[PDB]
Specification:
homodimer, 304 residues, alpha+beta, Thrombin, subunit H, main proteinase (3clpro) structure, domain 3, 3 domains, seven-stranded antiparallel β-sheet, 8 helices, 23% helix, elongated, binds 1-[4-(diphenylmethyl)piperazin-1-yl]ethan-1-one
C-alpha cells in the first residue's frame, strides 16, 4: 500500500533524447527511427521570437545547419521539414534504441510523465496533467524545450507532449508530436493568458477512491447526491462538470471499494463546502486532481 | 520555472532489475556486475515470516533454488551468500548494462528516487525521503520487495535503499545495499511501530526558497528570529531542530534570493503559528519537506 505521484519509468524515452542546435539556439530533440523531432523555434534568435515568420526563417536553413548530437556522437541530417510547430529532421541512422511508439493527442484531464532534459541529457522525471485550460504546470528552465510527455502501455511509448513555451504566469504550453499546440497558444514572445484552471473532478474522485483503498477514510460521509446537484456545487468551486461518462469510468473503483460513485460525490461535495479542517488525505492538504481513474487502478494493482 | 517533485531518470536502474524466485516466493533483485542483490526473505514461506531463522532456512537452499530471470532470459547462479538482510547471488554473467555505481547509506532527511518494480519489471518512479523515524512513505504492493532507492551524480548511480517491509501502519521499511535496515526494523511478521515522524525543517526551508525563486512570495514577512527562538517553535510543531550545519547548507539559496536564512526561519515560524489561511505554496496546502537544499539547487539550475 501507500499512494504516490508516480511517473512511468523513463528509460525508453531517455534512449531517444538528443541535442539539436541551429545557430546559437540549442534545445532537445526526440529521435525515433530516422527522424528527430524538435520545436521549430530552434531556428529562431531571441530577436526572431517577437514576431517570427517560420516559413521565411526556415528558407535560410539547410540540412547542415541543424546540428544533432546523440550523446557524444553527431548524426548526419539528410532532410528537414516543418509540420505545424515542430521540425522533423531526417537523419541517416535509425535510432537503435527506438521503442515501440505512437503519437497521441491527449484530452484535458489526462496525465502523463515528462522527462525534463537539457542539452539532450535527462535531468528528471515527473508526473503532469493536461489542465482543462490546455496548459501544464511543469518544471522547465531555458534549454528544456523539446523535452517530451508520454504514457507507456507495457512496451509501447505513447508520446503526447513536446515542451515549447513558458507563459508570463509561469505555466507551460506545448504541442502534441504532430506539432499542434494544446489550446490556443502560439510559439511567439507575445503575452498570451491562460483561461480558468478548473479542477478535474473525475480525477479528484479517483484519488478519493485511492485514499479509501489505502486507509484514509475520514472524509466518507452518510450522504449521497445526484449528478445535477453535485454539478451545482462543482460549478461554484470551479470544478469540471461531472458526466455519466466520468461515472462509468469510475465504475471499477466503485466496485472495488463498495462505495457508489454518487456517494463519493457527496463526500467530495462536503469537502468542498467545509474544507479539510486542518486534516490531510493521502498526505495532501488539498484535493489532488492529477491522477486519472486509470492511474489509480494501475498503481493500486501493480501494472508493469 | 515551475517546481515539481522530480525523480531521477530511471533508465540506468531499469537496466539492473531482475526477478528472483525461491520456491514460491518471487520478488525483485538488483543485478550489478555478476551479483544479484535481493531481500533475504525471498527464501521464506508465509509461515516462515512469523519467526524466521534465516541462517537455518538458508542451509536448505542451493544455488539452483534461486531462479534469476533478466527480462526473458535465465541467469546461472554460481554462488550465494547472506550479508545482513540481503542475499547476494553470484551469477555467471556480468550485467552488460551495469552503470557506474556506489552503495551509500543515507541520513534521515535525505531524498532519493524509487523505481517500484514487480516480477523484475519496472512499474513507476517516484521521489521519497528517509523520514527522521527511518521509515519511507512509498507505494509498494506485494511483489515490490527488492525495488531500490537511488540518487544519480551525472553517470554514477548511488544505491541507498532496498524495499523489504510494510509496517502495520502502511509505512515502509528497508535496508541499504549492505543489507542493514534503516532504523530498528527487522524482517519478521511482527508488529513494529514507527517513532515520531517529525518534519525535516532544513527541507521545508529549502522548499520555501524554491517557492520565492519560482514566484510564490506571499509568506515572506518583516521578521527575523534566532536559531534558539526558532527551535522552541520547531519543537512545539514536531519539526527537527535546526542547526548551524543546516544554515550553512542553505547558504547558496540564501545568496541567490538575498533572503537571510534566519529571516526565512521567521517566515516558517509564522506559517507554523498561523497556518496557510487557505493559501498554497508551490501548489501545496502543507509545508513540503521532501526536497533537500541540494534538490532545490539541482532543479532550479538544470543539472543533467
Ligand atoms: C523551453 C526552452 O528551452 N526555452 C523557452 C522558449 N525559448 C524560445 C526562444 C527561441 C529562440 C530564441 C530565444 C527564445 C521561445 C521564446 C518565446 C516564445 C516561444 C519560444 C527558448 C528557451
Ligand atoms: C514487498 C513485498 O514484496 N512483500 C512484502 C514482504 N513480504 C514478506 C514475505 C516473505 C515471504 C513470504 C511471505 C511474506 C515479509 C513478510 C513479513 C515481514 C517482512 C517481509 C513479501 C511481499
Amino acid at each position: 500500500s501507500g499512494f504516490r505521484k508516480m511517473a512511468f519509468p523513463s528509460g525508453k524515452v531517455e534512449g531517444c533524447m538528443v541535442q539539436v542546435t541551429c545557430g546559437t539556439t540549442t534545445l532537445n530533440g526526440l529521435w525515433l527511427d530516422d527522424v528527430v523531432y524538435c520545436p521549430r523555434h530552434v531556428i529562431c534568435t531571441s530577436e526572431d521570437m517577437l514576431n517570427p515568420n517560420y516559413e521565411d526563417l526556415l528558407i535560410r536553413k539547410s540540412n547542415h545547419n541543424f546540428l544533432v548530437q546523440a550523446g557524444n556522437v553527431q548524426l548526419r541530417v539528410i532532410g528537414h521539414s516543418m509540420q505545424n510547430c515542430v521540425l522533423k529532421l531526417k537523419v541517416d541512422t535509425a535510432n537503435p534504441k527506438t521503442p515501440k511508439y505512437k503519437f497521441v493527442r491527449i484530452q484535458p484531464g489526462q496525465t502523463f510523465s515528462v522527462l525534463a532534459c537539457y542539452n539532450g541529457s535527462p535531468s528528471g522525471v515527473y508526473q503532469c496533467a493536461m489542465r482543462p485550460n490546455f496548459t501544464i504546470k511543469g518544471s522547465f528552465l531555458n534549454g528544456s524545450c523539446g523535452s517530451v510527455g508520454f504514457n507507456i502501455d507495457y512496451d509501447c511509448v505513447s508520446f503526447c507532449y513536446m515542451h515549447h513555451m513558458e507563459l508570463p504566469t509561469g505555466v507551460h504550453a506545448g504541442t502534441d508530436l504532430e506539432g499542434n499546440f494544446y489550446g490556443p497558444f502560439v510559439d511567439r514572445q507575445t503575452a498570451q493568458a491562460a483561461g480558468t484552471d478548473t479542477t478535474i473532478t473525475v480525477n479528484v474522485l479517483a484519488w478519493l477512491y485511492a485514499a479509501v483503498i489505502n486507509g484514509d477514510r475520514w472524509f466518507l460521509n452518510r450522504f449521497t447526491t445526484t449528478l445535477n446537484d453535485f454539478n451545482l456545487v462543482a460549478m461554484k468551486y470551479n470544478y469540471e462538470p461531472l458526466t455519466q461518462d466520468h461515472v462509468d469510468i469510475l465504475g471499477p473503483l466503485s466496485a472495488q471499494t463498495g462505495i457508489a460513485v454518487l456517494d463519493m460525490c457527496a463526500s467530495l461535495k462536503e469537502l468542498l463546502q467545509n474544507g479539510m479542517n486542518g486534516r490531510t488525505i493521502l498526505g495532501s492538504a488539498l484535493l489532488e486532481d492529477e491522477f486519472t481513474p486509470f492511474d489509480v487502478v494501475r498503481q493500486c494493482s501493480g501494472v508493469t
